[PDB]
Design a protein around this ligand. Structure first.
Ligand SMILES: N[C@H](CCc1ccccc1)P(=O)(O)C[C@@H](Cc1ccccc1)C(=O)O
Ligand SMILES: [Mg+2]
Ligand SMILES: [Mg+2]
Ligand SMILES: [Mg+2]
Ligand SMILES: [Mg+2]
Ligand SMILES: [Zn+2]
Length: 889
């Protein structure tokens, strides 16, 4: 089990200049012939030539067309091919090999594998070595000349990177295609696709150079009608990169391909992007609303990788955030501009502060640039991606749009043909920073700590107002808790976007201001402040931090009603909810601990409830924003604020708070649900495949949120609305009708009805499975068994497995059953999945991430299941490393 250390980076003693591949696909095997045109680098010290090569069946290997002999001249251990130094040439040489691989039984979905009737590769991070021998690391840049051959009938469409330069018939019903890709690329960006693929296509003309680019979107025949939105999103992505960044696509064709079996969302293979079908395919009849935003983001993300990942690549895998953080940030800017709704920003923050904050306070805590790994596939994390994105977004906040665009352009121009590190990006931003500050002594050396320091900073505030002086002071403190990565934490460069609200009229008292906190603490003073303001802090969520605003509930209610910034309003609401949750939780817990026969609970603040009503009745307020305010914070956000969290107590706490609010607002909720129907469910453009209205979709989100609240509340005659909702043409509506019926005797009636609606579309079925899995059912364990026996069976499709099990793990009451049966269920699935797909087994561990934050009993139950999993004889390297890290061993 080799540990790879960031500090150990060294260039290779070898060069690979040219790759010539012949991939011959047959019924029971795939034959891969490869010639590597190689050289000795300046860094060479006479070492053995070692190729990565995992699970390859060697037919023959040669050096300069001379066949090598096993044992005497080389050894192979199924992982590494070692050719002894004395047999390696001292100048330019050819290494050739012929290996057998077996895509049909490749269930790990890495390297070359079969997805239904499509042969497809996945090479990032370490999958190319599963196809053929290579020095499988991103700094080994080479040209690629690739020929794919297969049965014409089964595999009429053949795709790889670069220009298709030849097509030819082969005897015995076969055919071939040659693809030459002269520009240098790393091997993780190699891809091949073979299948009976149908397509839509368009032509895009670039903004400045007026180049014609052919756009092709591919899928299985059955689902080709679902490709239209993806095509629109691709065009949008190209336009945005041209409009915001002045960046044009450089190649003559871009292919997007949907496959049914995929470990993640998608993959940015150069000119040949490959997608989880759930992230490319959609129709209004057969997709939930969420699919539309998801496709926009995933197509966007993959397109933006062309510059940030593909043209400027990574020196090494420790630089992963350089492409992932930066590309997520580019996708975020894009989606905000396309959706024109505040919920795009709000949703990313909602994800970061629940999922990523949990990761950063867990034993798995790491910086966005890790210092080490065993399995690189374990580091494609919410921290590297989503905290990386916030670190990338902070540059823009600090610089402003103009100077940010200037620094980004410096980065692209300086690094376009080559590999890069995180320091290269910081360097480019510093050039922009020197220009903005108007002095070349200014630097961003301190900013580099965002790359190296793990843990979430806590930012706290104290205030002072002098009425006589018209002087307002904001004292700010920053603190990161010690963890296993750094004993001593250092102050970070924290941008704090601030406004000051006049509480008398709700108006801005100052111009836009970003406070630059660069020390452990600082005091920021403002003159000519005419009245005591309410501070609007971290506008836009301006730094990835715990915000401790120290405001009263009165001050927070005023910001919630009157502030201009959507995040501060959402956060004020969040903070009001958290104070209430912590109070009522401690009250419930004391009553439990002290075995009380009677006790008191503190009611929900009545003026807060009045503020929610005000906001909901406001015609101008965003429907998506409205759905957040009626929803309590995520369980995974809350757990960061409670030691030894008793999940039953938290469940009782949420239940009380929801009941308190609904007791006052249920009539308002029902009135809104009915009044929103017309615009939310409008069918005017249902048969327009390209017409996508994010406001309307947020209106449905609100209606369905309200319906959920009313069904839990058992509002009079609400089952009538549920039954009518099940007759909606929109899957977001009729699948919601399934989940909300959980509280009524008609649940299995709607189970059968919605299954029949879902069963003939692969992706829709997986959405039905998620809805069943997340259903608030007392018999949920019996239902999951029904799902296993009747639908899931022995599927190895990650979409199916994840859909059956993951949503269930958010069932606070039932997943965390005190018997440990929920934990045993998921561990069994993890262990079973690990035998064929280590990556997905690793994904299925997500529920265990908070194990040491729970009450004593549940802590012991989870740890027991994790120790049981670690004891498994055949455990993967991926799963073993992940669980060892998570359990602090
Ligand atoms: N090149 C990346 C991951 C590829 C990979 C696959 C298997 C093992 C290791 C690495 P991606 O395009 O950033 C994948 C994104 C796709 C994505 C992008 C934007 C929003 C959601 C999903 C993801 O799922 O995390
Ligand atoms: Mg094999
Ligand atoms: Mg344009
Ligand atoms: Mg998003
Ligand atoms: Mg299937
Ligand atoms: Zn990416």
């Amino acid at each position: 089990p080799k540990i790879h250390y960031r500090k150990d980076y060294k260039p290779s003693g070898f060069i690979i200049n040219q790759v010539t591949l012949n991939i011959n696909i047959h019924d029971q095997e795939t034959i891969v012939r490869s010639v590597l045109d190689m050289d000795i680098s300046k860094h060479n010290v006479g070492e053995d030539l070692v190729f990565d090569g995992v699970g390859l069946k060697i037919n023959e290997i040669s050096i300069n067309n001379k066949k090598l002999v096993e044992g005497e001249e080389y050894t192979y251990d199924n992982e590494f091919l070692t050719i002894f130094s004395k047999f390696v040439p001292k100048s330019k040489f050819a290494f050739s090999s012929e290996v057998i691989i077996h895509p049909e039984t490749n269930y790990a979905l890495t390297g070359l594998y079969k997805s239904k009737n499509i042969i497809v590769s996945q090479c990032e991070a370490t999958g190319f070595r599963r196809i053929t021998f290579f020095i499988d690391r991103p700094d080994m840049m080479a040209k690629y000349d690739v020929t794919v051959t297969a049965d014409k009938e089964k595999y009429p469409v053949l795709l790889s990177n670069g220009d298709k330069v030849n097509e030819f018939e082969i005897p015995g019903g076969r055919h071939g295609a040659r693809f030459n890709d002269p520009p240098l690329k790393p091997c993780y960006l190699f891809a091949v696709v073979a299948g009976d693929l149908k397509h839509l296509s368009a032509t895009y003309i670039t903004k400045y150079t007026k180049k014609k680019v052919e756009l092709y979107v591919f899928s299985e025949e059955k689902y080709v009608s679902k490709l239209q939105w993806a095509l629109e999103c691709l065009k949008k992505s190209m336009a945005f990169d041209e409009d915001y960044f002045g960046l044009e696509y450089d190649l003559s064709r871009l292919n997007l391909v949907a496959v049914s079996d995929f470990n993640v969302g998608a993959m940015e293979n150069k000119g040949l992007n490959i997608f989880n079908a759930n992230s490319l395919l959609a129709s209004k009849k057969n997709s939930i609303d969420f699919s539309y935003a998801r496709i926009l983001t995933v197509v966007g993300h993959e397109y933006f990788h062309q510059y940030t990942g593909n043209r400027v690549t990574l020196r090494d895998w420790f630089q992963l955030t350089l492409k992932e953080g930066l590309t997520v940030h580019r996708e975020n800017l894009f989606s905000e501009e396309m959706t024109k709704t505040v919920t795009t920003r709000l949703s990313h923050v909602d994800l970061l502060r629940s999922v990523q904050f949990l990761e950063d306070s867990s034993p798995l805590s790491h910086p966005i640039r890790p210092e080490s790994y065993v399995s690189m596939e374990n580091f494609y994390t919410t921290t590297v991606y989503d905290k990386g994105s916030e670190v990338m977004r902070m540059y823009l906040t600090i610089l402003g749009e103009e100077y940010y665009k200037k620094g980004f352009d410096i980065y692209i121009k300086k690094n376009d043909g080559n590999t890069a590190t995180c320091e290269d990006f910081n360097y480019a931003m510093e050039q922009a920073y020197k220009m903005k500050k108007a002095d070349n002594s200014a630097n961003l050396n301190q900013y580099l700590l965002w790359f190296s320091q793990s843990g979430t900073p806590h930012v706290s505030f104290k205030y002072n107002y002098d009425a006589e002086k018209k002087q307002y002071s904001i004292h700010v403190n920053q603190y990161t808790k010690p963890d296993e990565n750094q004993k001593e934490k250092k102050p970070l460069f924290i941008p704090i976007s601030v406004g000051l609200i006049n509480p008398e009229n709700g108006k801005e008292m100052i111009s836009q201001t970003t406070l630059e906190l660069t020390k452990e603490s600082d005091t920021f003073v403002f003159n000519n402040i005419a009245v005591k303001p309410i501070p609007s802090l971290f506008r836009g969520f301006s730094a990835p931090v715990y915000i401790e605003d120290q405001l009263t509930d009165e001050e927070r209610i005023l910001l919630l009603k009157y502030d201009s910034d959507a995040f501060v309003r959402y956060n004020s609401c969040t903070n009001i909810y958290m104070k209430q949750i912590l109070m009522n939780y401690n009250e419930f817990l004391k009553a439990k601990n002290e075995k009380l026969e009677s006790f008191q609970l503190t009611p929900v603040n009545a003026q807060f409830i009045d503020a929610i009503k005000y906001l909901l009745e406001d015609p101008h307020a965003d429907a998506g924003f409205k759905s957040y305010i009626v929803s309590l914070p995520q369980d995974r956000y809350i757990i960061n604020f409670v030691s030894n969290l008793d999940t039953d107590v938290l469940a009782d706490t949420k239940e009380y708070i929801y009941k308190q609010i609904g007791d006052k607002l249920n009539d308002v909720y029902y009135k809104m649900f009915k009044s929103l129907e017309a615009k939310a469910d409008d069918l005017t453009y249902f048969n327009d495949e390209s017409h996508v209205d994010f406001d309307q979709m947020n209106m449905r989100t609100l209606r369905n949120t309200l319906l959920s609240l009313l069904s839990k509340a058992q509002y009079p005659n609400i089952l009538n609305e549920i039954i009518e909702h099940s007759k909606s043409p929109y899957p977001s509506n009729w699948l919601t009708s399934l989940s909300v019926s959980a509280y009524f005797d008609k649940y299995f009636e709607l189970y059968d009805k919605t299954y029949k609606l879902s069963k003939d579309d692969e992706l829709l079925l997986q959405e039905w499975l998620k809805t069943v899995s997340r259903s608030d059912r007392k018999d949920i364990y019996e239902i999951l068994k029904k799902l296993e026996n009747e639908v899931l069976k022995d599927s190895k499709n990650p979409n199916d497995i994840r859909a059956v099990y993951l949503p269930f793990t958010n069932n606070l009451r039932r997943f965390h059953d005190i018997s440990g049966k929920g934990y045993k269920l998921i561990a069994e699935v993890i262990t079973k999945t690990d035998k064929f797909n280590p990556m997905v087994a690793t994904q299925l561990c997500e529920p265990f991430k908070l194990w040491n934050k729970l009450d004593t009993k549940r802590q012991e139950l989870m740890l027991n299941e994790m120790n049981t999993m670690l004891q498994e004889p055949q455990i993967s390297n991926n799963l073993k490393e992940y669980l060892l890290r998570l359990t602090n061993k």
